[PDB]
C-alpha cells in the first residue's frame, strides 16, 4: 500500500530534519570570526583568447597547467596553450550542439558531449595527419550535461535523463548506473581520490555516490532552485553548490547538513559555475549579470569583481597548481586571470 | 627551443587558416530551431521541406541549418537556452488538437518562450498546422467561451470556397496568440502567424528570415 510507505517516509524525513538541527553546534559564523579577512583582491587579466566563434559552454584545464581544452556551439573543440597563446589542436565536431568537454589526466584523450546524446572520445596521438573520433559512447536517453575522466579508461558522464553512467572505452558498455534523481543532472565533479562523486540535479538536491558500487551515500537539500554547478573542496570532505537563487551553499559530507551560505541583496541573477582555489579560502562563482565574483569563504565578504567579460559567464575553471584562473563567457572570448 | 616555437607558430598559422575558412562557411548558414507538440505533426512538415535530426535544404541558394528536438525529455527549461542565437524559432501547433486542451498548453508555452530573458532577442514563427482536421471537426466554445461572441476581423481575406466559421476560428486563435505575444513589450523579437497544412513553407520561412535580418540591421542603425 502506498499510504504506509508515504507515512514512513514522512516521519523518517521529519526525524532526520530534527536530528540535523539537534546536532548542529558551532554554525561556522561564531567559530570563524577570529580569522582575519583576506581583503580586496584586484586581479588583472593576463591573456585574452579570441579564436572562437560561438558562445563557450565548457572548458577543462590540464594536469601540467599548460594546455587547456575548450568547446563552442559552432562545432569546434580547440585546445589552447596558456603560455604561448598559440592553438594546438582544432577538431571539427560532427555535432554543433555541445555542452561539456573533459580533458584526460594523462592528456592523451579528450571527450565532449551535448545535445547529440553521444559521448565522443578523441585521441591527440596523430597517425595520419588528422584527428578523428576514436569511440562513441552512445546509449544515454537525454542530453549529456557533464563528463569527467576517472583515468585513461574509466569515464563518468551525467545526462538529462535523471541518471548518471560509467563507461569503459575498450568495450563501450555501461558498468555502473546511478539512479534515483528526479531532476535533470547539470554537472558532476570528482573527488581528489576519485572514490566518491557528487552530482547536482534540478530538484535542488545533491547526492553523493560511490563510483564502484553505485549507491547514494547522502542527499543534501536546502536550495530554492535548480543546482547548476558543483565543486569539491580541496580537503575532500566537503563540496559547494550554486543555483539560480543568487546564493551559494557549502555542504559537509560528515555533517550531512549545510554549513555556510553566500547570499547578497544586490545580486539576484543565477549562478552557473562554482570553483575553489588550491587553498580553498576563495570561492570563484560565475553570475548572469555579465561578470564574475570572487566570494571569500568562511566569511561571506566579497573580495573582488571580475568584470572583464561582455556576456554571461557560462563556465569558469582553475588550474591544477592554482597559478591562473580561466573564465569563459558567451562572447566567444576566453580570459586568463592571475 | 627556437625550433619548437617555429613549429608551434606554423601550426597556429595553419589552424588560423582553417578556422577562417570554417568561419566564413559557418556565417553563410542560417540556424533555425523547430518546435512543436506531440500532436502538432511536425513530421509531415519536415517531409514537406540520434538526439537531434539535423536537416539541410537550400532556397534561392541560401543554406539553412534547421534542427529537430527528436528524442528528448519534455522538460525544456534547461536546454532551450542553447537555441538563443538562432535566426528564428519555428513553432508548429495543431489547431484541431479533443482528449485534452492542447491549445492552452501551447499558449502557455508560447507565453513562457516569448518572455524568456535569454530568448527575448529571438523571433518566433507560429504555424497553425492541421487546418483540414479543424475544418472537419468544426463541420471550441467549451475551452474558449470568447469564441461565441467573436466577430470576423474586417481585414480578413478568406480563400474562395471556405465556410466562414473555420476562418473566424483560425482568426480568433491568431488574435489570441498575437495578444499574448504583445501583452508585454517586445524588443528584437517579433511574431508572424501563418497558416500551413503546403509546399510554400520554405518560401515563407525564407521571407521571415529576410524580414528578421532587415529589421535587426535597422535596429542596429537605430532607424526602426
Amino acid at each position: 500500500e502506498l499510504d504506509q510507505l508515504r507515512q514512513e517516509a514522512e516521519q523518517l524525513k521529519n526525524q532526520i530534519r530534527d536530528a540535523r538541527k539537534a546536532c548542529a553546534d558551532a554554525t561556522l559564523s561564531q567559530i570563524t570570526n577570529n580569522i582575519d579577512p583576506v581583503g580586496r583582491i584586484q586581479m588583472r587579466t593576463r591573456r585574452t583568447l579570441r579564436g572562437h566563434l560561438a558562445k563557450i559552454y565548457a572548458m577543462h584545464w590540464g594536469t601540467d597547467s599548460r594546455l587547456l581544452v575548450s568547446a563552442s556551439q559552432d562545432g569546434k573543440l580547440i585546445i589552447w596553450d596558456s603560455y604561448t597563446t598559440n592553438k594546438v589542436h582544432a577538431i571539427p565536431l560532427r555535432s554543433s550542439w555541445v555542452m561539456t568537454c573533459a580533458y584526460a589526466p594523462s592528456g592523451n584523450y579528450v571527450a565532449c558531449g551535448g545535445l547529440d546524446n553521444i559521448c565522443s572520445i578523441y585521441n591527440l596521438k596523430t597517425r595520419e595527419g588528422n584527428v578523428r573520433v576514436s569511440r562513441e559512447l552512445a546509449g544515454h536517453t537525454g542530453y549529456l550535461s557533464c563528463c569527467r575522466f576517472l583515468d585513461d579508461n574509466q569515464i563518468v558522464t551525467s545526462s538529462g535523463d535523471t541518471t548518471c553512467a560509467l563507461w569503459d572505452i575498450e568495450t563501450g558498455q555501461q558498468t555502473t548506473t546511478f539512479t534515483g534523481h528526479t531532476g535533470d543532472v547539470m554537472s558532476l565533479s570528482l573527488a581528489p581520490d576519485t572514490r566518491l562523486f557528487v552530482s547536482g540535479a534540478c530538484d535542488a538536491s545533491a547526492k553523493l555516490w560511490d563510483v564502484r558500487e553505485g549507491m547514494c551515500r547522502q542527499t543534501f537539500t536546502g536550495h530554492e532552485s535548480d543546482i547548476n554547478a558543483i565543486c569539491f573542496f580541496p580537503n575532500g570532505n566537503a563540496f559547494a553548490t550554486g543555483s539560480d537563487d543568487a546564493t551559494c551553499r557549502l555542504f559537509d559530507l560528515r555533517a550531512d547538513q549545510e554549513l555556510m551560505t553566500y547570499s547578497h541583496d544586490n545580486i539576484i541573477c543565477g549562478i552557473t559555475s562554482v570553483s575553489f582555489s588550491k587553498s580553498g579560502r576563495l570561492l570563484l562563482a560565475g553570475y548572469d549579470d555579465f561578470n564574475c565574483n570572487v566570494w571569500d569563504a568562511l566569511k561571506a565578504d566579497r573580495a573582488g569583481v571580475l568584470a572583464g567579460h561582455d556576456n554571461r559567464v557560462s563556465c569558469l575553471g582553475v588550474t591544477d597548481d592554482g597559478m591562473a584562473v580561466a573564465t569563459g563567457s558567451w562572447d566567444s572570448f576566453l580570459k586568463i586571470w592571475n | 627551443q627556437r625550433n619548437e616555437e617555429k613549429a608551434q607558430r606554423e601550426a597556429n598559422k595553419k589552424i588560423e587558416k582553417q578556422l577562417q575558412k570554417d568561419k566564413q562557411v559557418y556565417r553563410a548558414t542560417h540556424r533555425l530551431l523547430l518546435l512543436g507538440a506531440g500532436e502538432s505533426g511536425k513530421n509531415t512538415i519536415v517531409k514537406q521541406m540520434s538526439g537531434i535530426f539535423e536537416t539541410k535544404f537550400q532556397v534561392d541558394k541560401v543554406n539553412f541549418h534547421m534542427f529537430d528536438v527528436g528524442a528528448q525529455r519534455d522538460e525544456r527549461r534547461k536546454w532551450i537556452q542553447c537555441f538563443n542565437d538562432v535566426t528564428a524559432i519555428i513553432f508548429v501547433v495543431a489547431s484541431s488538437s479533443n482528449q485534452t486542451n492542447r491549445l492552452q498548453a501551447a499558449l502557455k508555452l508560447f507565453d513562457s518562450i516569448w518572455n524568456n530573458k535569454w530568448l527575448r532577442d529571438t523571433s518566433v514563427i507560429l504555424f497553425l498546422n492541421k487546418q483540414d482536421l479543424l475544418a472537419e471537426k468544426v463541420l471550441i466554445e467549451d475551452y474558449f467561451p470568447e469564441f461565441a461572441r467573436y466577430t470576423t476581423p474586417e481585414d480578413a481575406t478568406p480563400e474562395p470556397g471556405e465556410d466562414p466559421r473555420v476562418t473566424r476560428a483560425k482568426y480568433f486563435i491568431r488574435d489570441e496568440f498575437l495578444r499574448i505575444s504583445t501583452a508585454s513589450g517586445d524588443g528584437r523579437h517579433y511574431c508572424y502567424p501563418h497558416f500551413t497544412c503546403d509546399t510554400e513553407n520554405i518560401r515563407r520561412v525564407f521571407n521571415d528570415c529576410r524580414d528578421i535580418i532587415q529589421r535587426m540591421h535597422l535596429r542596429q542603425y537605430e532607424l526602426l
Partner: nanobody
Framework: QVQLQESGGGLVQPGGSLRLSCAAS????????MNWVRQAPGKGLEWVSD????????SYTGSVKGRFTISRDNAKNTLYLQMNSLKPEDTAVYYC?????????????????????RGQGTQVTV
C-alpha cells in the same frame, strides 16, 4: 526540500463551495509564482490559473473564467483556491505547483510530468 502540501477536498454535491489551501514552506513565497494545475482521470496535466509575484496581474484558463478565483496572503506563506460553483468536468486531482525561477515572470515546465515542485494533491468529487 520544498513542500506544497494541500488541505481540504472531499465529497460534496454539485454547486458547492470548496476552499483549497496550499501550505507552501521552505522558501520565499513572494519571490515565486504559484500555479494551479489539474490532472483529469486518464488525462494529462492541464494548466488552470496562475498569480503574479505581487498579485497585480492574474490570469485564468478559458474554461474556468469567472467561476473561480484566487487570493494570495504573503504573511501566511500559503495559497488559496475558492471554487464558488462546481461542474461535472471538474472531478480530478488538483495540484499547486511553483514557478521554477524567482524574479522572472516566465514559468517553464509547470505542466510537465514528474515535476519536482508539485504537491501531493487532493480528491474532489461532484
Amino acid at each position: 526540500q520544498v513542500q506544497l502540501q494541500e488541505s481540504g477536498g472531499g465529497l460534496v454535491q454539485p454547486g458547492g463551495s470548496l476552499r483549497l489551501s496550499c501550505a507552501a514552506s521552505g522558501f520565499t513565497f513572494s519571490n515565486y509564482k504559484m500555479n494551479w494545475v489539474r490532472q483529469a482521470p486518464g488525462k494529462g496535466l492541464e494548466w488552470v490559473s496562475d498569480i503574479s509575484q505581487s498579485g497585480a496581474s492574474i490570469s485564468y484558463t478559458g474554461s474556468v473564467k469567472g467561476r473561480f478565483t484566487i487570493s494570495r496572503d504573503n504573511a501566511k506563506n500559503t495559497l488559496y483556491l475558492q471554487m464558488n460553483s462546481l461542474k461535472p468536468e471538474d472531478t480530478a486531482v488538483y495540484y499547486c505547483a511553483r514557478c521554477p525561477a524567482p524574479f522572472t515572470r516566465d514559468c517553464f515546465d509547470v505542466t510537465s510530468t514528474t515535476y519536482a515542485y508539485r504537491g501531493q494533491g487532493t480528491q474532489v468529487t461532484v
